[PDB]
Amino acid sequence: HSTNVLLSLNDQRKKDVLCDVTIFVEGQRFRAHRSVLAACSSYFHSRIVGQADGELNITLPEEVTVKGFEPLIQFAYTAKLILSKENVDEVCKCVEFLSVHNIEESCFQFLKFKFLD
Amino acid sequence: QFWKQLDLSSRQQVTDELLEKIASRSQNIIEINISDCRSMSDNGVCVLAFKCPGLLRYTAYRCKQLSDTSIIAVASHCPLLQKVHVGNQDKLTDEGLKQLGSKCRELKDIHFGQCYKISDEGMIVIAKGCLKLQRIYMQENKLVTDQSVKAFAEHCPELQYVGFMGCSVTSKGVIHLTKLRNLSSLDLRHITELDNETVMEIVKRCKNLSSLNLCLNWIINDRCVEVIAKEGQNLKELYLVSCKITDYALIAIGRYSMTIETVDVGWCKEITDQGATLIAQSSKSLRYLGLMRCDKVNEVTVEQLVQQYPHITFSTVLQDCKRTLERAYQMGWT
């Protein structure tokens, strides 16, 4: 539905063709579209809508990690997140930094609270 | 003649110690573009500035390998410069910005986005001289305060574009912007405090405003929008995103304003329907009603209204079919 649409731009991005926005995270350049990021995060809508045309570059600040932003772009397209306990803290840090509303916190990290208690 | 417009951007490993050979054989280059460079060091511009006394449009976006000695050689050897556009070039300090304002009193456009070492000490000196300034742009550069917006409106009376996104400016230093009678566009996103009083008495005085980019400013309320709507004569671009406005700014900006083309009420947690159906029905001019992530807006509503109003273009999460409408040129996917 809404899907099967986003799937097409996911297949485009995975093959690196017809991409508008380039994201820079600790040097590495990541390709993505405009509307997907604009619907994913307000931190991207604000910095996307102002500029205007073909090639837009957004450099995220230092505290964003390539192991935390490697996901959430998957999440923006596929609508699922990868949760490996080897790396959850940086994912949550990047989530709260970029202010993504799709993922709650008191309903998400409570698994660790339950396991510890 | 075909030279003089180098434009060697996105040439990562094909821009080695060659700028000397592109300079010795071809002189009087008036514009250089080495953005997204990764090969040359600062002794690749410290040699070209000694061979190009007539540079006008230096641009070095996102080249972190450079340092202050690039600017301390571009300004010390080019006494006629009109545009310095550096980008995320963290390493640049205030010991290179002073020589860019004390030796080049011809600069008309600057850009210092995301250089988290630029304090107001260098900004005061760049405003002491450089009186012929027209455009200024700063990204989230901290250590830049109201003491630099209160020295850029006193010694620079020909400023047209002002950008202070993510800076540390307070409303007391923003109110010192009504003294630029030639102001055209504002870019006041995500600042410490914009109040509500100063916003109205910037559109009450600067009668040349065509854009107002105040965004991610939660304190801004609805009444401010209708004041702007009634008192904006040249406005054409209002960008209210994540601001605290409740489904009445839409009617205000579409019933009390004659000139408007682009409004971006977006990611606002309270934008009920009838808002986009009243602004569209009442507005005498509207080319863009970007809503986006307005989780109280119906898709039947803005599909049966999109069909009814072909003049206006809308922006919702569902408007990804327009991005997947550029496959009408390549296709070949599925």
Tell me how far the alpha carbon of residue B178 is from its chain's centroid: 19
Q: What distance in Å separates the CA atoms of residue B19 and residue B185, rounded to the nearest whole number?
A: 37
Question: Which residues of A have a CB under 8 Å from any CB of B?
Answer: 2, 5-6, 8-9, 11-12, 17-18, 24, 33-36, 38-39, 42, 45-46, 49-50, 57, 59, 61, 101
Q: For residues B288 and B285, what is the distance between their CA atoms, to the nearest angstrom? A: 10
CB pairs under 8 A between A and B: 72
| Strands B211-212 and B237-238, bridge-based pairing | parallel
Q: Are residues B210 and B230 in the same domain?
A: yes
Q: Which two structure tokens, joined as six digits, stand for B238?
A: 């209002």
Place of tokens 């009243």: B278
Is B278 inside any structural domain? yes
Cβ within 8 Å, pair B239-A49: yes
Q: What is the dihedral sign for C-alpha B314, B318, B319, B322?
A: negative
User: What residues contact A38, with CB distance under 8 A and at least 6 apart?
Assistant: A44, A45, A48, A49, B292, B293, B315
| Shortest CA gap B103–chain A (Å) | 31
Q: What is the CATH number of the domain that holds B156?
A: 3.80.10.10
Q: Are A22 and A11 in contact (CB under 8 A)?
A: no
Exposed (0-12), middle (13-18) or buried (19+): which is B202, by Cβ within 10 Å?
Answer: buried
Structure tokens at B149: 């917006």
C-alpha B102/C-alpha B107 separation (Å) is 11
Q: Is residue B334 part of a domain?
A: no
Cβ contacts of residue B112 below 8 Å, gap of 6+? B86, B92, B118, B137, B138, B139, B141
- The terminus-to-terminus CA distance of chain B in angstroms comes to 47
Tokens 């209160």 -> residue: B150
- Same domain for B254 and B189, yes or no, is yes
Domain boundary among B53, B86, B119: B86
Rounded Cα distance between A66 and B218, Å, is 30
Q: d(Cα A86, Cα A66) in Å, to the nearest integer?
A: 14
| SS percent in chain B: helix, strand, coil, step 5 | 25, 10, 65
Q: Write the CATH number for A51.
A: 3.30.710.10
Query: What total of structural domains would you count in chain B?
Result: 2
Q: Are A33 and B323 in contact (CB under 8 A)?
A: yes
* Last residue within a domain, chosen from B70, B86, B102: B86
Q: Which structural domain range is residue A104 located in?
A: 6-116
Is residue B333 one of the residues assigned to a domain?
Answer: no
Provide the domain limits for residue B92.
87-328
Q: Which of B283, B279, B290 is nearest to B259 (CA)?
A: B283
Question: Are B150 and B30 in a shared domain?
Answer: no
For B170-312, where are the E strands, in sequence order? 185-187, 211-212, 237-238, 262-263, 288-290
Strand B313-315: give its sheet, edge to edge.
B161-163, B185-187, B211-212, B237-238, B262-263, B288-290, B313-315
Same domain assignment for residues B1 and B35: yes
What does residue B135 show for φ and ψ, rounded to 5 degrees? -125, 140
Residues B197 and B48 in one domain: no
Residue A96 is assigned to a structural domain of this protein? yes
At A58, which helix (H) or strand (E)? strand A56-59
Q: Tell me which of B10, B117, B317 to substitute to probe the interface with A (most A C-beta atoms closer than 10 Å).
A: B317
Tokens of A47: 């910095």
Among B97, B105, B91, B87, residue whose Cα is nearest residue B33:
B87
Question: At B297, phi and psi to the nearest 5?
Answer: -115, 130
**Cβ neighbours for B43, distance < 8 A, ≥ 6 positions apart:** none
| Residues of B whose CB is below 8 A from A12 | 333
Task: Give the end of a domain, one of B86, B107, B136.
Answer: B86
Task: Mark whether B45 and B188 lie in a shared domain.
Answer: no
Q: Are residues B174 and B273 in the same domain?
A: yes
B106 and B45 in a common domain: no
Position B72, amino acid: I
Q: How far apart are CA B60 and CA B257, in angstroms?
A: 41
Residue of B175, B162, B45, B68 whose CA lies nearest to B117 = B68
Count of domains in chain A?
A: 1
Query: How open is the CA angle B45-B47-B49, to the nearest 5 degrees?
Result: 65
Which residue's structure tokens are 């005498």? B284
What does A54-81 look like in DSSP terms, one character per residue? S-EEEE--TT--HHHHSTTHHHHHHS--
Domain identity same for B149 and B102: yes
In a domain? residue A1: no
User: Does residue B119 lie in a domain region?
Assistant: yes
Indicate the Cα dihedral angle B13, B17, B18, B23, nearest 10°.
Answer: 140
Kindly give, in sequence order, each residue whose CB lies less than 8 Å from that of residue B89, ignoring residues fewer than 6 positions away: B60, B62, B63, B64, B66, B115
Do B111 and B16 belong together in one domain?
no
Placement of tokens 């931190």 in the chain: A43
Residues B54 and B113 in one domain: no
Q: β-strands B109-112, B161-163: how paired?
A: unpaired
**Tokens encoding B130:** 């450089």
CB atoms A8 and B187 under 8 Å: no
Report which secondary-structure segment, H or E, holds B199: helix B197-203
Q: How far is CA B221 from CA B96, B101, B171, B200, B229, in A?
A: 41, 39, 15, 11, 13
Nearest to B27 by CA among B59, B63, B54: B54
Same-domain pairing of B225 and B287: yes
Contacts with B259 (C-beta within 8 Å, 6 or more apart), sequence order: B232, B233, B234, B235, B236, B285
- The widest CA-to-CA distance across chain A, in whole angstroms, is 52
Determine if residue B284 is left, alpha or beta; phi over 0 gives left, psi from -120 to 50 gives alpha, anything else beta. alpha
Closest residue of chain A to B212, computed from CA coordinates:
A50
B320 vs A5, A17, A59: nearest CB: A5
Give the count of beta carbons closer than 10 Å to the beta carbon of residue B127: 22
Total residue length of chain A? 117
Which of B207, B196, B191 has the alpha carbon at shortest distance from B245? B196
Say if CB B126 and CB B100 are below 8 A apart: yes
Residue type, B152: F
